[PDB]
Paper text:
[name]-type ionotropic glutamate receptors (AMPARs) are integral to fast excitatory synaptic transmission and have vital roles in synaptic plasticity, motor coordination, learning and memory. AMPARs are tetrameric assemblies composed of subunits [name] to [name] and exhibit a modular architecture comprising three layers: the extracellular N-terminal domain (ATD), the extracellular ligand-binding domain ([name]) and the transmembrane domain ([name]).
To elucidate the architecture and subunit arrangement of CP-AMPARs, we characterized the structure of cerebellar [name]-containing CP-AMPARs in the presence of MPQX, a competitive antagonist that stabilizes receptors in a resting, non-desensitized state. Of note, the olfactomedin domains of NOE1 or NOE3 align exceptionally well with this density, enabling us to conclude that class 2 represents a noelin–[name] complex. Consequently, the receptors in class 2 are A1A4A1A4 receptors, in which A4 occupies the B and D positions and A1 is located at the A and C positions. The focused classification and refinement of the [name]–[name] layer yielded similar results to the non-NOE1–A1A4A1A4 complex, resulting in a 4.2 Å resolution map that revealed four auxiliary subunits at the A′ to D′ positions. Notably, NOE1 stabilizes the amino-terminal domain layer without affecting gating properties of the receptor.
Numbering used by the authors:
A (entry chain B): 397 to 550, 571 to 820
B (entry chain C): 389 to 543, 566 to 814
C (entry chain D): 397 to 547, 572 to 819
D (entry chain A): 389 to 543, 566 to 815
E (entry chain H): 6 to 40, 55 to 82, 93 to 165, 174 to 208
F (entry chain F): 5 to 40, 55 to 81, 93 to 166, 170 to 207
Amino acid sequence: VVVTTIMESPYVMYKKNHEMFEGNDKYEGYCVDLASEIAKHIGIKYKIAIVPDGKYGARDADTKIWNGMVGELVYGKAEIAIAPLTITLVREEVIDFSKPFMSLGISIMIKKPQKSKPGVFSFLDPLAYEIWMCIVFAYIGVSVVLFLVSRFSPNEFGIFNSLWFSLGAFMQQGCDISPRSLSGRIVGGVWWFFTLIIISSYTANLAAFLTVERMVSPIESAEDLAKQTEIAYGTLDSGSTKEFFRRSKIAVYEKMWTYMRSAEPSVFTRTTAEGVARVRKSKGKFAFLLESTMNEYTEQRKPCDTMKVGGNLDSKGYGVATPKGSSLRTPVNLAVLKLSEAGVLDKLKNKWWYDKGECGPKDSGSKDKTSALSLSNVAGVFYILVGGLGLAMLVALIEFCYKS
Amino acid sequence: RTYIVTTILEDPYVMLKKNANQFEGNDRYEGYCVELAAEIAKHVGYSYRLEIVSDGKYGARDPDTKAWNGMVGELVYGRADVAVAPLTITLVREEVIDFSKPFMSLGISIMIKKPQKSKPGVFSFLDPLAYEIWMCIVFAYIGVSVVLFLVSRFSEFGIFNSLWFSLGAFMQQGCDISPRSLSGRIVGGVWWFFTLIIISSYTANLAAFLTVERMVSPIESAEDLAKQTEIAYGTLEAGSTKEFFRRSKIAVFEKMWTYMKSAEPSVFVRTTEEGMIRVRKSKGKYAYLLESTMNEYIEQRKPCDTMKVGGNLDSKGYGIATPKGSALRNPVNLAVLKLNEQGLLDKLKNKWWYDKGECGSGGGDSKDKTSALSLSNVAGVFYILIGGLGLAMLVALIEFCYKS
Amino acid sequence: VVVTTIMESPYVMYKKNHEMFEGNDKYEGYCVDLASEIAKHIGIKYKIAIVPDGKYGARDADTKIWNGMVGELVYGKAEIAIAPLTITLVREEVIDFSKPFMSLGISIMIKKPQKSKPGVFSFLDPLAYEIWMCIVFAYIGVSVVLFLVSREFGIFNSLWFSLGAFMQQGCDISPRSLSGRIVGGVWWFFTLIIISSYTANLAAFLTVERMVSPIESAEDLAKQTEIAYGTLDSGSTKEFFRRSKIAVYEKMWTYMRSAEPSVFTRTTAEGVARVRKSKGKFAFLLESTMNEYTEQRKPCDTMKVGGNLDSKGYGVATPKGSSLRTPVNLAVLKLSEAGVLDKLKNKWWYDKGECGPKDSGSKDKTSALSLSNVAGVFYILVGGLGLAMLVALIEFCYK
Amino acid sequence: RTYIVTTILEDPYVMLKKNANQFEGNDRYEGYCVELAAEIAKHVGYSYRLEIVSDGKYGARDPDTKAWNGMVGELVYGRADVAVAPLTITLVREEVIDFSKPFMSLGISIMIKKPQKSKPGVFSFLDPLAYEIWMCIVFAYIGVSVVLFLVSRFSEFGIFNSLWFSLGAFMQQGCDISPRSLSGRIVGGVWWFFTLIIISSYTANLAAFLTVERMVSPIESAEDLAKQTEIAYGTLEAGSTKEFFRRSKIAVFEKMWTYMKSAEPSVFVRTTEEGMIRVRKSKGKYAYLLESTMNEYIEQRKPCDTMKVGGNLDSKGYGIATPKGSALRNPVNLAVLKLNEQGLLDKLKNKWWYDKGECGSGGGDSKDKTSALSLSNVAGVFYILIGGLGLAMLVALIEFCYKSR
Amino acid sequence: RGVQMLLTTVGAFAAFSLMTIAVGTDYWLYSRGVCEEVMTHSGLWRTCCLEGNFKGLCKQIDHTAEYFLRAVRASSIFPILSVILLFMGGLCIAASEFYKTRHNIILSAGIFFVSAGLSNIIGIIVYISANAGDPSYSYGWSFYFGALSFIIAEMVGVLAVHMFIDRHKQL
Amino acid sequence: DRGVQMLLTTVGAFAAFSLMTIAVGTDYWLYSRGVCEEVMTHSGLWRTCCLEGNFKGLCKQIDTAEYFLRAVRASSIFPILSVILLFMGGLCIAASEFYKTRHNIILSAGIFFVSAGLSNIIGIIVYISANAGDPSKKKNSYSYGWSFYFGALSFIIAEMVGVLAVHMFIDRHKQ
Ligand SMILES: O=c1[nH]c2cc(C(F)(F)F)c(N3CCOCC3)cc2n(CP(=O)(O)O)c1=O
Ligand SMILES: O=c1[nH]c2cc(C(F)(F)F)c(N3CCOCC3)cc2n(CP(=O)(O)O)c1=O
Ligand SMILES: O=c1[nH]c2cc(C(F)(F)F)c(N3CCOCC3)cc2n(CP(=O)(O)O)c1=O
């Protein structure tokens, strides 16, 4: 009995380095343990031989030869193979496949953000956006009504005095002299009430903003990813994902393909290692597209900077390949089905995928990072400071030129 | 000859047109399954006549005291060859017949109601306090206003001056006129102390409410639902969900299974539509697990108040029944895998599950969570601003009428 | 083999389906399942019987007989006793005991810890008392300094200036001395910084609403507190407290002997009913298993165990001259070592419970602020207003 | 006849006297075990003379060449009738000889360092705003002060009035120096806006810092340890604790057993002493998971930085070893049960574990748990304020110069 | 200035009528309570449920700083003294409108009346504090008459201090 | 007593000139711990170099509401405009100390001193925004160097001259 397994896949791991625990079980992983489990289930001799082709499987129909595990099975040197192998049109007609033990997904991934350091938008982040315009409109209106009360109703206050009175009214400090009337007291009181409610709401809002943090994702779906058109995207230079994107039928996928058509900075990455290095180097743009299993494998790797958004662009699965029909095809099919129905396959999957990872142990977020008000949250505050003081000096100079 | 295709009466796949009457004959059914049957008959080449199973049940091949019936029962009896219908892959229906290929992936998942909270207007302004406290502070303000006026008349100033000084004292303002005598000075001091303590308390309460409102844990995946222990969950008494829960192996799913077996929320469901009704009527206090296919069908066809959350708990597939010793086993497998890989099946799924759905979730964009205020609670600030402008126009018009 | 057991609520209970089956498969819990496990371990047919007397097992010390399980095994009625039975000095010369498979002792229990609602203390619930003593001391000091360094600022004008500075307001009049400006600025800065700190502390207190453990958390704190304490009428706890030489329990014994005689209760149900009606009253000292049973029942209000005191063992009883004594000893040792009594204990006393809120904390809505946190302000407000109008009347009538 | 008892010293049983070996021998033994041996010899009547352990260990099953060692190995291989030194209950110990009764119980318990922290003084004032922001706002305050003087004297109202208005503006207090021109008014307004947003941001950050500092809770029980992150913990290797962890099958116990099974850090250590010393060296995140008895012993040691937290995970017990068929098996069982009931064992535990401890004699040393800003953190402001007031007093004397010199 | 004294007289008489309606009858307790949720009512010396399981009966109810506030909130002795002090305030206002040449004692009567008003304020707020202290109550359209009693007290006070302002011109 | 005041203004301006020259000459701004690894690197506004490491001896030049500030940080346009306006202020106060008849000269001097304060604030705020604006920056940080303190002292003597010369403006205006 000969079984093949590609070592260049996230399904095997070396035991120590070499000449330690020597023998037959030199590789430990998902696929080899599944093979051992089914061999204990039905009775199958254990083998260690690996095809020197390297590729999982390909159809070189131009030369009428099959390369990889599927070619090694169809020409004949083995009968049982456990490896990550996709199922396609040309592979089924030559080699029958069993039921898929694991579902495959294709998804986009982005780099985990670090922080946001904008300019005036730092101070603009709380208390929304339109509230500023509405409160400036309210300030102008209350200044107009105060000027009308002071002038039309029965004084020594012009438009500048009225706007200064309204500005000091907005800032819970007081005034130099009261209008001393029964009319202005109520409007001054309601304006003071509104501005103190606004200031208390701002303080509470910033306290709630700073006590906890959420890190909302910039994107949530592939449709929104295509619609935003601000982050670079690259699938792969060639392979199953590129072929699926080049020959898709869903309406948004043709738009996505035309977006790849007008790609300037060489989004076609030669190797997946270069792609993950590029997406882990720069977080501002260049989000990647990759298979779900490889993304989940990179989710538990020492850099610990990656996050998927969910959603499966394409659905397929990994199956067990056997050469033609024999007395072992039905046996291995029922063995795979029985192991898939039972949780033992899921037990092995969860164990080997979560016990080998350390990045996901710190789930959600870490609350032990507070420090103080660094300049990131203060850059807006001091930028509005420098703008206000510069504009105040400028208007002081022009008002001196106007009057004195 | 003329071949037959048997189809189970299932809601999300095949529809018997409610009009009945005309269009009877070949086009008696419109839906996913009949379209797939027409496509496979046009591809491999035969004529199909629709049939309905007698007992109306899926059936199984359990080793009971005979009395075998169902879809596989009528397949093995002789009067059935091709069954284009949904069919879960199970070991009890594999020992006699084999399936071709899972065209789509099945997965059990939790379903949740839509969390919708509409913040009121002027009611939301008094939300970060008790209305008794607002009544207390306003009535204490007017009481200390008249008391301050009488003690100033006892130990220059009028009713308007008294109101101005009292409200400016109420809300941390300076004044041009001085509170003469030590008695008036200490009244002003103690009432300033009260307004400072009450403004600090109000700001603290608003900060606490916003902190507890933002710091919330939405339910995702299964671990969060397992360790929240606040929302009821359950499945059917019998079916694939009960079989999967009985054979759990993972520690977290073992905890979920023993929590379900504790019978604190029980199952409380007979038909899954009744579970959908009771989870709509639970106002988010209950949750229910069911298949992703029917969950998507509920989220589309029913009014948009329920959807899915989290990933699939397990990997499962579909299939079409084929005879053990017929010539219609391999070509149908090759053609259905061709349709699955090409994406025409994906196109039909998109057409039947995204186009003819009276829901704006997939037909329009969602709402972006920008945090801070969103014209919901500050909307109440704008309605008390509307009250403020009402008081301002009231006092201005009544003053002009009094002078008139 | 035949075994007798005593109907004890946290060890054996009647099943809901009483009419489904009668016999061996009629009970569920710690005792009967442990008996089934050890019987399957050695290999024997076993039957379950109830005690005819109901006694826990003690010597009457006058007729030289035993009533209960020890009385039945001594007089030849049962050759094994899987029912729980504590190890005492009197129950060794007539009966044999195995190694203790459970550890129990006398533990404290209090009522439900809830948030208090004081009237005056809620005005300054955060911060402390010395903080406001020092702020008043600093207020008087800065008033005196400002009055002395400015020489219109008399013995009332400077006081008014400092008081206005204490609540974020300026003043109508300002001095012409830079010393006064400096002292007013630093006092304004201190007032603003302490008001900000107080407001933030109140916000944190209101947003956590965390309940702190009461004073009754240790025996030393139990002896130093004014709260009441109680125990059972006559039993293992009473026998332990009758004779002591540890120099920490004699004070507790004198506290029992000097307080009201209401501290003694007949049954544990009456005791939990008596402690349930008041947040304070008398905290009790009772068995650890009784506390663990009561903390996982439908009234999920009191679930406080506190510190662990005393040592006691629960063991299986076997008669003298039995060939299975070594067999049952090695059996209970194997179950204690490999671990299935602890697994069943976790599955039954912890996993099987009316509420699971003790496993993980939950967040509750803080609701409205109510008025208890504000009621203390109105009292000093009306008191200061009354003092002010009385002094105004006196000053205007006299001067 | 004189009876020899096998005694092995770890802590604090057979510790030798501080006067070296100037005494007569066996009479120079002080501890819990030797006092219990003297009492149990006086109860029924025999000799309590100690014996020297041959191997210095406790003994193991030793599947190679069978045999036995330790105290139980000396007991089974003749020349021993009474064993006083404590030893754990194990199946291989029971399959050869039998115990009497566990005189006092124990269990494996979690061990953490005592949380010790001190609030700062003037440095506590710069917690929620760091120190660069304070310098920036102070220098901006003097800049806007000289700018306000420029616009007041360019567009009374001297430098003194400008400082008055700026100092009133920095705390939103106001002043009576109101210029006729709108320029100084708008300068004051924008400076009011700046100082108010600084005050609001400071309040927000101090509230957030206090909430996040006080919200965290100390570790307790075992479930919180199971869901704990970023803190290391484990047990030793040469001991029965690892065997008990491996033999457990409870879902939570097997859960964290699988958690530290992939021991990426140095979870397993060799000896208790070296592990304790390296915990002292680290003192930020580690737990040793030792027995409750030795943990209670080491929390009474000289450094006084260790404490007992949580409960016992199991119900292990001690026992005094006796040979099978001897005449000193049942009377010693009756007498040890009598002393266990009498509470004399509790008295000996109190005197040799809480009274003779030179450090930490009073366990209730810090239990107020003041969850508010006491006079340790905010009173540092009271320092700098009085320092500022002292500065005020200092400038007062130089202003006294401006008054009189 | 006859309008001023007739306004004081009509305000005092209206305050008499509405405060008698407020304190005399048994109408002020609405809450989600159990007397089985049925209509309940508190009172000055007794508590009564109009319908339900307590029909035809009207039961005489029972019950340093904490003890004092509990006694004031439960026994309601201080509200009794406050409404009786309102009665003497109304009687001395009647004496004031009978003795129109009373320069200082009319002002003293005003001070006594506003003192009774603030005493009623402190009483009703400690009452609702004790109502909120039960777990660890709304306007009953007669507790609304108590609120209107506060409003009419403030109104008669402000028109009174308006006519002492008129007295400043008169004197 | 105006000769001592004008001498104080002159010596303050000379101190400001000396501080500006040693700022544009030396590179003691920040005692940063970077690479040449956390090692003492003279991070400069105009010249950044090192003292330790394997690459010691060779160093080079450094480099809708963020692009302008980034270009300001890269080009150092505001410190350059600041030192030019200090040069202009020195020239104008030299004209004031040589020519007493003119009056607008000290108006220009006061405007130049105040704009020096403005430009110094802008420069220091863009410098601390460049230093503290990155979340990546690194076990140790902060601990500003000596030239930050020299710039602070230049700012303090800037209010000193901007108070005393403006007081001289007030007294010459009232006389
Ligand atoms: O049968 C096939 N099975 C495959 C399985 C895997 C995976 F399981 F993820 F390892 C991958 N990885 C994709 C990501 O980078 C590493 C290799 C490639 C596969 N390919 C080549 P494709 O045609 O480029 O997809 C096949 O042909
Ligand atoms: O040794 C003894 N151990 C005991 C242990 C328990 C239990 F808690 F169940 F474990 C009890 N239960 C207390 C609650 O009511 C049912 C009996 C009684 C015990 N008694 C009888 P006492 O003489 O009344 O103390 C003993 O003597
Ligand atoms: O019988 C036994 N009795 C033991 C008694 C003790 C203790 F009392 F605590 F001194 C200890 N200590 C454990 C902590 O470090 C110091 C030694 C070990 C014992 N062991 C070996 P284990 O396999 O480590 O339990 C036994 O075999």
